[PDB]
Symmetry: T
Subunit: 167 residues, 12 copies
């Protein structure tokens, strides 16, 4: 949106915003896949519930990706065109499943959530009072990432508590 960008360029560094958004975009796709494949391999304590959350969270990150990519286009930017570039652009590094047990996978995904939380706070901070539209997108995604963290932490807490309780 050329006229909108023209107006926004007066208030903040749009070019930098686009770079941050493409880093975010790369991170969303990685977090998406990480959950998706995690769902496919998770085993053990509370598996059906944890698998279910991973599936749900995969779908939520995918939607995040779309919100971000659509906004990049509105800012006259180009979203990352090649998945090979995700790894360069991402600050949050892809955390591949090795151990398939639920605690291991829950811990990996919690770290990625923390890094997601850090990204959208930055973008919200960067755009607050300047790019109202991008700011609200970041805040929306942020709220969901905090919920994701909480959801995963609850399972970790429950499994830890079960373990104690059984001794």
């Amino acid at each position: 949106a050329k006229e909108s960008v023209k107006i926004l360029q007066g208030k903040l560094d749009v070019k930098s915003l686009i770079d941050q958004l493409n880093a975010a975009l790369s991170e969303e796709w990685l977090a998406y896949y990480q959950y998706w494949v995690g769902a496919l391999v998770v085993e053990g304590a509370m598996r059906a519930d944890v698998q279910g959350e991973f599936e749900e969270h995969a779908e939520e990150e995918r939607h995040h990706a779309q919100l971000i990519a659509d906004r990049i286009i509105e800012l006259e930017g180009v979203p990352v065109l090649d998945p090979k570039k995700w790894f360069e652009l991402a600050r949050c590094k892809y955390d591949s499943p090795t151990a398939f047990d639920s605690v291991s996978l829950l811990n990996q995904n919690v770290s990625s959530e923390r890094c997601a939380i850090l990204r959208y706070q930055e973008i919200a901070n960067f755009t607050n009072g300047k790019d109202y539209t991008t700011c609200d997108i970041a805040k929306h995604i942020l709220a969901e990432e905090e919920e994701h963290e909480q959801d995963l932490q609850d399972y970790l807490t429950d499994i830890a508590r079960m373990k104690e309780s059984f001794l």
Copy 2:
């Protein structure tokens, strides 16, 4: 409903019925909150399932409250106007969460269900063959309280059984 009450006053003590209903109403609001907050804090074995039941049961007690309150109005009564009075009127005492583990919360809520079962049997007994409408309301709620008890007991049974099984 003045004409209805006129007819019913010939068959039973409506004034006493209203008092019983207001004690029941008080109890429903307490049971409602108890489940609601219990859902918010429950941790441990089978948490997602137990939390889910607490949420569902919270909503079911709320609906019980409406059935009772609406009927009080039809009996030309006034429902309890102030939550401060719930504690005076209730026979079932509010059972505050202290321990957040699922067995603790399950046991507390099972106690409340037993108390609710006693209430609606009384009201059903009091109204059977006399106030058909209020009787059917009591029986309806009763059936749901018995199901609630069963639901909670099943988790207690499952967690006890897991514990054995793991040794």
Copy 3:
């Protein structure tokens, strides 16, 4: 959410935020019940409409409570565990029905609303630019409380206006 709270503790007093949220939570449950019982007893001018709003508003405060409680949990807090504590924590005092006429009940609920608006403006102000997520929750609830106020005021206005109109 431990990592989220860790980050937020650098920007604001989360402990204080939780206390404000638990006061808000207490207030929501009281406002909820107030509307719910009000709906059950309201009589007089425009009763069906006013009763309807009370029922709708009861459900809306009920949802506010959930938004607040869920967020308390995310801030590593514990929501108020006992209704007996609502009265201590609440700044907005429960306003029990005495008169059952619609103007009386409307006026009571308008006060409760104005007090709610003040609560969420405070929380919004406290969290603005710092806890984006909690701030948006407060702003969301706030927007609804302002609508509730407007809804109730409209009935007061209409009834007052009818009264005038009928003398002539």
Copy 4:
């Protein structure tokens, strides 16, 4: 249902039950029409709400009629085949609109309701513990008639209360 009736004839006077049901059926159709035409002509205080209830109640009596008629067939009876007979069979007399104001129409329908409540209490009492199926039908209808009474009384109460309130 021949085998079901055979069994029930050992427990109660089914022939009498059928007669009571056909009197009830007649009454439902009259109550149905009364509400339906009442809705069409009602004017004055709280008209839109009162008209709405009349329309809703018309539909609810209509459904009562079906419950009753279906059960008559199950008891090997024949439902009243001619509307001309409704008036003979009905204990509740059709209460034709004369005054179209809402209080007048509300009062007429409240009488019809009270008469309906009496009918279903009788049928419930007659069948209690004996014809479980018919009893539950009567109790179901009864619960609705009590609600109808309450709904109508509320408007009477509100209008009376408005009237007072406006003098001052």
Copy 5:
């Protein structure tokens, strides 16, 4: 609708129109009940289908009644306030079930449909080009009565044809 009626009074005899509509209304209620009770007692050939049509047709006549009554009100008329008057006002006489077999009931209802068809043609003729709104209502109902006739005739045709075929 006072202003609408004022305009229409210049084009046709509204008072007469209202009388015709009230005769139609009376007839709809009778036809409604006739189908309703017919459905309750029908037996024999193609009973489930014939019963089903009677039920459907009952509901369709009921809706006709509402269309007519609502329009009477808009013409500043009063719809018939007492069912006792239906029999006076109706041209189509109520045709009570005596024989419960489907051919008997089908023939009775076909007669009623013929009578209904005559009514709405009259009203359509009376209002054509003058009271556009009432005319379209009459035509709408007419189309449905013609369909009702067809529906009933088809069963008569099918049962007659079965009879032949089986000899």
Copy 6:
């Protein structure tokens, strides 16, 4: 639709029809806004119901506009392209809210309705037996305008009747 218009030009003055439709279109947009803003400001007797009708009627006039505009396009016409022209083209004059009480607003909208009824009767008369499609559109809109009139009159009747009833 060129071929359709070609055929219709043999039966009636299509150019004149289009002008009538554009006057109607202008009137719909004015009636639409009138109801829409009326809904926003109405106060007093039966306000919630009256406001509700205004909102519903606003949406119904909005749909009338679309039916008319679409048909203009089918008649190879151009709908009015500038709201500034509505006022010139409209026979029904925009009736701005001054008094916000429900009787005042009801009376204003009843006039607008009566004027709408006249418009569609004209168009129906103009097209009857000649432009079947446009005629049915006018008749459809007409039937709705008559209902709108009735709806509004009912409230006037009810409020007048309440007023009487309350003196005694």
Copy 7:
């Protein structure tokens, strides 16, 4: 539900109630299958309608089974674990299709309905005023069995009447 049963044991013989429920349960499964397979093989007069009812009734008995089994569990009982036992426990004997014509199948299913009607009247009688919850279940099922009887009898009546009519 242990607390509920404790309360009920004071009012009636729960053990006996459970045995009656398991006999009922066995009967429901047999009635279910009987309708299900009857639907699959029915031929002749009004076949499509009769087949349709059999299909519907099969589904209704299956739901009855669930209501009964769920309540058995709530009464601290164990539902019949093995279909081989159905035949021992059932009073209503499975009535296998031999003749596939609709009258034959209708008669068989009517007899099973009669026996179903007898069962739930007994259970209703046994539990009336004592086990409100189980009583309402029995009454609910009873109402449906009476409807089933009526539905089947109507076809028998129609076919008989067709037969006459065609001579």
Copy 8:
């Protein structure tokens, strides 16, 4: 519908009406297929939109066919029993696709719409004020044919305008 036809025979030539309806019916089936196969082969400018309209219009003509055929039956007529006869009865001649480009197909279908428009105006004229029911059917179909014409003309207009614009 025998009684309805009896009444209508007094007002117009029903036999002739039926012949006109069967010509219309034949035309609808041809127009239906023409659109259907046109959709399957269309190529070029605005293809996806034009294909979509052809698909939609095919479905609309099919519904027209049903309205007409159902009414023929109500008029005691027999609808054309054999597709071989469509070509004899149709005034609108089937216009087979030769050129598959959108302008060619749009022009062919516009001509068929014009001929459809002519048919229903005739039938409306023939039945106006006499057979209210058949008249309303013709008018309903007519309105849709005029819309079809408009829809197709719009594409022709757009493509012509694009062509200019690009030079």
Copy 9:
């Protein structure tokens, strides 16, 4: 689909496949109309049910036609562009209604079903293991034609069985 066809041309005679599909297409349109007009004129035993099936089957053949036509396009073929050609291409000959009784119409439609069955067995045989996609289409349609045959045969069986039973 040019690349797909290129691959398929190595495995089978695509040109012949297209011809078989166009013959099938022609046959579907004829079977479609046959059922559609049959529904409009059927009379007699079990008419409502038989009419209903004809209506349902009409719709099912019409969907078959779409599956076949779409696939022809994917095989780079052209579907039959003119209904006049249906009769040349079809092996299954159009079986026009003469007698309107249900047995006559049922018998005619059964023959056409058998003919459809032969067609899709052929096409399934022709494409099995070679054109997986077209094979699955043919098998899908085949399964529905077998069901159609069964549906129709059931009515013939029922009517024959009624006839006996009534003597």
Copy 10:
């Protein structure tokens, strides 16, 4: 479907196919009940999830039974008319619940799944390329039985993995 069967009798032994289908049918009813009663009594580790699967799988086997029975009818066969015969015909023996813990019940149902898997592989092999319709039914059911096996194995895997993890 007589004509379809006539054609199929040339390609395979239909009589044998019917016997295999009736054995499968018997097996589906047993597997259906097994899951259904298993759901009612299951206790312990992951109970809510395991109970849920048993309920879902009960419903899926019940649908399998319908697919098989319907096809038997189409092959001019008669489905097993008496549940007493299920035990004779079934290869998969009914595996009655003894121990109510989830591992025990999971193991029992896994064995029955394997047995269902064998059955549909056989029937698919028997009919492949010959009875396309029955083959696709067998393959459809097969795919679901493989999924069932996977579902159940997952829980066994999770519970085994929890056990380890807790020591």
Copy 11:
């Protein structure tokens, strides 16, 4: 909302806010009509798509109008009561269709979107941190205006690109 406004008057100039909102309201109604009539007359390149967007955007501006008007009322203001005043109050001038081609109409509407974007940024800036509720409304509308701009620009881009590509 008197108490709300009382509070807000301490934080900002509400009177000025209301004037800005009424200017915005005026502008929304003009933008609404502009799109609405534009949709009615648009011709040429990508017409169906562009027409569709105009229709969608018309509906979106209408909704904007309601959000604004409702908020004016809550701020104890009066929304503009007469459309004649829209032109005085609006900063964005109504841009009447002259040329009906899609590029012309797209350019006109893009201008209007730019003007709308300026308005809601102003209102957002004016209310940020002070009137949270009105601010969020402005931001919400802003986000949609930026999307509208993007949507329109994409068509301009596509049509320009087509033009090049075709030479």
Copy 12:
């Protein structure tokens, strides 16, 4: 599914099948992203339609990935756990957008479709008659890839045909 795999290992090389599936899985994710980002950047002729297809096809490939991954798990395999490996495993190479015009993007996606087509023909061939379940998955995906190819080719055909037509 251990028992299922045991049976399948007798009929084919499951280990090889898993490798082929993981290559397919990798390919689906790449084709998914390719379409997704292509939708985001496409410009020019028929953009809205082409963009829409890319969006739809993105979603369809994403579902393909799930079908394949789920089946890998059932074959006791592990799906590719890291997106970095997609590029190694994929035969179909990721075809990054360079030119954003619709013809360029359409051509790129057509090539990838052909490559998907080859893959599922291979897997269908590999598993035909041996792994019925995996074969049907491959055939299902295959049918969709053929449709995708057709969809894309249609646009190329239309745009080429427009170009000619405009000169």
